[PDB]
Assembly symmetry: C2
Homo-oligomer: 79 residues x 2
Amino acid sequence: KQYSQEELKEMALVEIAHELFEEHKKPVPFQELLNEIASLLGVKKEELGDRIAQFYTDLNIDGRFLALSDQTWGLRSWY
Amino acid sequence: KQYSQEELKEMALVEIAHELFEEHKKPVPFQELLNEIASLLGVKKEELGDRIAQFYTDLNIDGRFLALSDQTWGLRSWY
Ligand code: NI
Ligand code: NI
């Protein structure tokens, strides 16, 4: 889009998420948003470690976003 | 508690939910919140219907409330 990776590195994770939602047009679970945001920032999501809580808080405080109910499922064999 | 049912009848659901949380101090699933609110208003869960959606949007927009990622568990028997 309209942001270089340098600009994105300057942004609040919530504003990157807002940009992602605006192009996805669908609900996205938190771990997938972290993966997508990590990839735009040139990192792996575990490297964000420090900014996860600010991010989560902001999603909660900003009324642009809703926490939706849906269940994530996976395979037992993966863990 | 400091509210009569007559006072509760003139509050937004979200304001009742805030008092319940302050009263009980633990996380609640949304349906249980509804269950407890409907009981305090002496109505049946169904009777609210139209206000539920506005209730879930207030919870999202009001910055005092966090949507928690914790998993709700229950018994298959109950359904
Ligand atoms: Ni929110
Ligand atoms: Ni909120």
